[PDB]
Amino acid sequence: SHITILTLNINGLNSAIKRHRLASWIKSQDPSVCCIQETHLTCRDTHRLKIKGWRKIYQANGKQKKAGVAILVSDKTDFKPTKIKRDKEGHYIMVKGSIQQEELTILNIYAPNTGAPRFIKQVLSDLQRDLDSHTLIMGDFNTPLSTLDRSTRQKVNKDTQELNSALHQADLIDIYRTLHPKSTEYTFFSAPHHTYSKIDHIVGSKALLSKCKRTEIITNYLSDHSAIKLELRIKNSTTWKLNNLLLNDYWVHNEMKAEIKMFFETNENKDTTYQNLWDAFKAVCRGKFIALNAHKRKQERSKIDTLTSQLKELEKQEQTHSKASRRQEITKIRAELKEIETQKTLQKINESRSWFFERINKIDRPLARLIKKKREKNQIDTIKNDKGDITTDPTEIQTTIREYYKHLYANKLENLEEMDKFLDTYTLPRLNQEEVESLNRPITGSEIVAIINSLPTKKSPGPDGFTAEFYQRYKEELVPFLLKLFQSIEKEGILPNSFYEASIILIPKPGRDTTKKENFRPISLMNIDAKILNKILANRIQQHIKKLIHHDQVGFIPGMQGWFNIRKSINVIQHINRAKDKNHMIISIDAEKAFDKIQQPFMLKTLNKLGIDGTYFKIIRAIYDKPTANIILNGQKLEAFPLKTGTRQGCPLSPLLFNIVLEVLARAIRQEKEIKGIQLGKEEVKLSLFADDMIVYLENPIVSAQNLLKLISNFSKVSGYKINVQKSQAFLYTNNRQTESQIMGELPFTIASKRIKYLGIQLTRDVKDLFKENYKPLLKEIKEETNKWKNIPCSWVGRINIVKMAILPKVIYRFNAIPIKLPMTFFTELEKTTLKFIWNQKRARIAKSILSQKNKAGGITLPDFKLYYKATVTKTAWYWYQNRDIDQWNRTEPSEIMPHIYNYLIFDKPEKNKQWGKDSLFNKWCWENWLAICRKLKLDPFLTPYTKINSRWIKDLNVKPKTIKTLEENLGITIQDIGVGKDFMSKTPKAMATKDKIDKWDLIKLKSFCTAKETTIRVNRQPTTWEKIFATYSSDKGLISRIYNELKQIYKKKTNNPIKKWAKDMNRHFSKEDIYAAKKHMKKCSSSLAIREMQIKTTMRYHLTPVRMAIIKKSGNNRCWRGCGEIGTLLHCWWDCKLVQPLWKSVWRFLRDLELEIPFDPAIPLLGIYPNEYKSCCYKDTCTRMFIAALFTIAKTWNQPKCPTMIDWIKKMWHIYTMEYYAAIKNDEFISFVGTWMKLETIILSKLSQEQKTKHRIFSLIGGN
RNA sequence: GCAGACUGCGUAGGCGUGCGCACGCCUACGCAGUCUGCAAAAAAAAAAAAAAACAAUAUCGGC
DNA sequence: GCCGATATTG
Ligand SMILES: Cc1cn([C@H]2C[C@H](O)[C@@H](COP(=O)(O)OP(=O)(O)OP(=O)(O)O)O2)c(=O)[nH]c1=O
C-alpha cells in the first residue's frame, strides 16, 4: 500500500479542454492525492471546479484571476481532515488530518516568484507550530533547493541556504533529493533561458522517509512544469461492473457475440450441470469484457500511444544529448499531442453537452437532479454505536454494521409445528388445479425475452457486473441459453451459486437519525439473471394474485390504488364522528423492518398451504435456500453473512411473497369475530392498508384491541412479523374520560389526538379538519418548495416542466386521496404561486390561456390544477359505473339513505328529492362535478348508449331480478346490446334466444320501454368521447389523464391568439393552414427544447418591445434599443431594423448560396409560415435551423446598438450542428442528420477562413480534416 | 400592450335558509374599467445521466 | 398502443 501524491502548476484552469484533459490524465495516473497550483479560480468560481468521480475537493481561491490552489484526495484515500486554513489570495492552504489512523500534516504553498525564500520562511515561522513528523509541504515553491536542481548547475543563492537552514531546524528535508541523491531531473524548461530547473519540491519530515516508497519527476506536456509523484508506504480489488457505453461499439459487440457462441459451442457437455456452466460463462464473459475494454482503450488512443512513445524515445535522446533540430521536432510533436488530446476532449465534452442539449429542459434526469438538492452523502463515517459511542474508526464501524445486519438476518426460529398450527386455523384461499398448473408451466423463450425487454435500464448491476443492458443487447443469442438454464433450474431445483450473491447497500431512511445504525434501509442489488428468474416467478404468481389476496391489501397489487384505503379510512373516521356512542378506535400499525423479519420457512409453509406446489414452489424454495448478501459499505465489500430470514428487499418477487405472508395475518384478523371492526351499512371494514403498513378500525377497543394485540403477537411469534408499537399511532374515541384513560392504560399504543400520517396523508381525528391538515400544509409546502427555487437557473419552459414534475404529482396524489370540496381560494393561491415561480416573480410573458391550451397551441401545456382537481374528483364516477365489488372504499359512506344506490346515478334517472347526505365527503362532490361536466357537454346523462341493463330503468319496470340476471348473462350489460326500436332483441341469434327465454310479462315490459321513441332516440345516438371515457374502458389505468384531456377540450377558452397578432402587425391575414403550419413548426422545429423554446418565444411575441415598455411606463420613447431611430414594434426588432437587417441579408445570402430562392418574407423565419407553393421539407429541415440560429443571434443582442454579427450566427449554427451531430450518433439518426446538415456545413466551411474557424474550433464533423 | 389582481354589470347551474319571491356561497361566463415587474434578455446554469435496488400507482411527453 | 422520463406509496 502506497500513497501517490501529485503536485502540478497548471498555469490556470480557465480552459475547459485543459481542465478535463488534466482530469483525464490524472485519472490515468490514479494518484492518491493531488495538489494543484494556479487554478485561476476565484471564491465565486469554486462552482467551476466540479469533477465527476471525485467528491472531497478543497479549494483556496484568491480574488483575482491569477492565483488559487486546491488539494484532491483520492476516494481510495481515507484522509480525515481536522483543521483547514486557506489563503485569501490562494498562495497557501493548510489541512491537518490523518490517513488510515496515521496522522498526516499537508501544506500547500505558492510563493511569489520574487523573494520566495523570504516568503516561505515567513510561512515557516507562521506554521512553525504546525510542523510535525508527518508534514508534507507542497505547491509551487518557485525555487530550486540544490545545485543539481538547475540545468546550469548554478550555486544555490544565499536565500536558498537560509531557506535550507530553516527547513533543517524544522526537521524537514527534500524528499526527492533524499530518495534520489544523484538524480538531476528537472520539472520546468525556461524558453527565454533555454534552461531546465527543478523548482517544485516535495518536502517532509525525515520520519516519513521510513514510510516513503518512491518519488519521481514525470515530465508532461499538459503543463510547462513537471509533476513530482511520491509514493508513501503504509501498513497493508473492487467489484468489476460492466459499463453500458462499452456495448455501443460495433467491434466489441461482434467480439462478444463470437465469444458467447464459441463458449456455448465448446464448454457445453454432459459432465457439467447447466448452473455451473452458466456461472463459468459469467466468469469467462467477465474476463473477456475486461480484456476487450483494455483493448478498446488501447485502440482508441493508439495514435496518442504511438505519439507518446515517439516523444518518450526522443525525450530520452534529448536528455542524453539535446539538439536544436531535436528541440524543434519535440516541440512540433508536442503540439501534435496537444491537438490530438484537445480533439478527444472536445469530443467527450461536446458529447456530454449534446446529451444535456437534447434534455435541456425536458422532464428528465438533468431537470430531476437539478431540482433535487445536492445528494446527501450516503457514505457513512460515524454512527452512534451500540452502547453510547459515536465512533469513527472505519474498521470498527464496519464491524458494527456487519454484525448488526448479520444478527438481524440470522434467525429462523425452527418451530414448524407452531407454524402448521397457526396456518391450519384461519382457512385462507387456495389456487385451483388450473392456476397451479399455470404457475408450473414450462419457461418459454417468449417469457424470458419479454422480461428482458421490460427489464429496467440505467440500473446498477448486482455482484456480477452485468447491468441488464448486456442481456438486452445479447438478448437474441443469450435467450436460448437463459431458457436452457431455467429448464435445468426448474427440473432440478438448484440455482447457480452466483444467484444467491447480493450486494446490500444502506440507504438512509428519510426523516430518521442517520447516526443510528438501525435507521438505514438495506436494499439489495442482485445478479440480473437472478432478477430475471425472480421476475418470472413474480409475474407467474401475479397472474393469480387477485384471488390470492383480499382487496384490503392494495400494496404491490396490480390495479389497486393506495388512495382506496385513504378514502375508506376517512369514511370510517367520518362515521366515528357521526356515531352517537363514539366507543371505537383506529390504530395505524406499522411493521418494524418488514421484508427482513419475515421468516422464510414460514413463508414457504404459507405458499405450500396456498396450493402452490411443484415446479414453482421448488424454485421458490431454491431461491431462498442459501441466500447471501455482501454489504458494500463505503465502497468496500464486507463478508457474506448468509441472511437466514427476511426476503431480499431488492428482489422483484419479494413484494408479492411478503403480501402473501401478511395476507395470513389479514385473514386471521378478518376471521376473528372478537376483533369486531367498524360496521358501515352492510360491510365489515376491520382493516385495510398497504403491504406492511396496516390500519385497523375497532369497536369496543377495551376488548377488540386486546384481541388484536394477542393475534398480532401470535403471528409475530410464528412468522417473525414484529410491530414497533411505539411508532404506531392511533385515534381513540370514547364518551367517558375514565374509559379513555383506562383504555390508554391497557393499550400499548400512542394515541395521537390530532392526526396520523398515513400514506402521505394527514388522517385527521375529526374529518372536519381534513383540508386544514392536508391541503393547507401542502399548499404552504409548495410555496416553501417553490420559494427555494426562486433563483433556480431554468427558463420559463424549464420552470413549467419543474412544476409538472415536482408539484403536479404531489398535488394529484393529494387530490386522489382527499377529493373534498376545495375552496377556490386554494386554487387561486396555488396557481398564483406556481405562475410566480414560472416567471421568477415577474409578470407572465405568455398568456396563461395560451399555455394552458393543449400542445396544439404550440406551448408546453402549463398544468391547470383546477382541471386536474375536477378530473380527479369526477374520476370516481368511473368506479361508480363499474360497480366493482372490490372497491369497498366507495360503499363505505354515511348510511342515512340506502347506501346501495351509488353504482346508479350514472346513466340513469336522478332520484328527485333523494339526498346523498350533507355529511357525504367525496361522493356528493363527485356527483356535482360529474353533473356539471355533463351539463357543459349539453348531453343527457340519465339515458345513454352505456346505460347498464340494470340501473333503474329496468328496475322501475318492476322487473324480477332473475330477468335482469338472464339479460346480463345472455347478451351483455348495456341497454344498447339489448337494442331499441327495430333492433330490440333483433341483432344477434342470442338476442332472439333471450327474447324467447323471457317471460311474457317481463318481455312485454321490455318491449314497451325499449321500443319507446324517447328511449330509442336517447340510446341510439352515438356516444360522445366523455361517455366512452367512463363506459368503454374496463380498466382505470390512465383515467385521470383521459378525463383531464377531455376537460381541457371542453373548457378550451377562446384565447387571444398571438399568431393572429403577428398577422395583424404584419398586415397579412394568415390562413388557418398557415396557423396550423406555424404551430406544427413550433412543435417540431427541433427535438431539443432550447431550440423549441426559442421558436415558441419568438412566435408568441415573448420579447417585450419598446412599444410595450413605452405603454407600461407611459414614456413616449418608442425608439428601438439600438439607435436605429425607427418605431420599436416587435416586427421592427425582429425583422425591420437597419441594425438587424444585415444579419437577415447574410442569412439570405447563405440561402441563395444553398440554391434556395425563398421569399424575403418575415413570416418564414419568425414563424415558419412558408408560402403554400413551397412545401419541400428537405430544405425546410435546414432552413429551420438556419432561421433559429439567426433568432438566437438577434435575441442575444436584443437591445444593444450592437449589430447581430454574422460571426455570432455562424457560432450558434455550429453549436446546434455539433449538438445535433452527437445526439444523432447516439440515437442512430445519422443519415437524416447528414441529409439536413451536409450542404450547410459545406457552405459554412467555405465562407470562413482557416484562422477564424480554428479560433472558434469550427472543425468539420461529417467530413474529415 | 400580454396577463393576473380586482370594482361593478349581468346570464345560467347547483347547494343552504326563509315565506312564485328574497337572501348567502360557489361554479362557468362575457363586458367596461384601474393598475403593474420591468431592466432588458440570452444567465450559464451546469443541471448530470452513471448508481441505490424492488412492486404497484399516477403523470407527462415523444414514437 | 409502446417507450422513455418524473413523482407517490411502501
Ligand atoms: C420505502 C421502501 C420500502 N420498500 C419495501 C421494503 C419494506 O420492507 C417495505 C415496507 O417499507 P416501510 O413500511 O415504509 O418501511 P419499514 O416498515 O420496513 O421501516 P420501519 O421498520 O422503521 O417501520 O417496503 C422498499 O423495497 N424500498 C423502499 O424504498
Author numbering: 6 to 241, 247 to 1275
From the paper:
As cellular assays concur that L1 templates require a 3′ poly(A) tract, we used adenosine in the single-stranded region. We halted elongation after 5 bp of cDNA synthesis with dideoxyguanosine triphosphate (ddGTP) replacing dGTP (Fig. 1f (right)). Using this sample, we obtained the cryo-EM structure of the RNP in a paused elongation state at an overall resolution of 3.2 Å. This resolution enabled us to model the entire protein chain and the individual nucleotides, including a dTTP bound as a nucleotide substrate but unable to join the cDNA 3′ end. The incoming dTTP and the dideoxy-guanosine at the primer 3′ end (ddG-13) are positioned by the canonical FADD active-site motif and by the conserved aromatic residues Phe566 and Phe605. The incoming dTTP hydrogen bonds with three RT domain residues, including the Arg531 side chain. The array of protein–RNA interactions bends the template RNA to follow an L-shaped architecture. Notably, our structure captures the CTS domain forcing apart the RNA stem-loop strands at the base of the stem through the steric barrier defined by an α-helix (hereafter, termed insertion helix), which forks the RNA stem. In the structure, the first three stem base pairs are splayed apart concurrent with Ile1121 and Ile1122 of the insertion helix forming hydrophobic interactions with the splayed bases G-1 and C-46 (Ile1121 and Ile1122), G-45 and U-44 (Ile1122).
